[PDB]
Amino acid sequence: DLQRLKFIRHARQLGFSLESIRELLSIRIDPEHHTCQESKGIVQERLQEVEARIAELQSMQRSLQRLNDACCGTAHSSVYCSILEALEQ
Ligand SMILES: [Zn+2]
Ligand SMILES: [Zn+2]
Residue-by-residue DSSP string for 38-58: HHHHHHHHHHHHHHHHHHHHH
Measured between alpha carbons, how far is 37 from 69 in angstroms, rounded to an integer?
47
Q: Which residues are annotated as a binding site for Zn(2+)?
A: 71-72, 76, 81
Distance 85 CA to ligand 1 centre (A): 12
Q: How far apart are alpha carbons 43 and 34 in whole angstroms?
A: 15
Query: Which one, of 23, 25, 24, 20, lies nearest residue 45 by Cα?
Result: 20
> Which of the ligands is closest to the CA of residue 86?
2
Q: How far is the CA of 87 from the centre of ligand 1 (A)?
A: 15
- List residues forming the annotated binding site: 71-72, 76, 81
Q: Which fold has domain 1-89?
A: Multidrug-efflux Transporter Regulator; Chain: A; Domain 2 (1.10.1660)
Type of residue found at 72 = C
Experimental method: X-ray
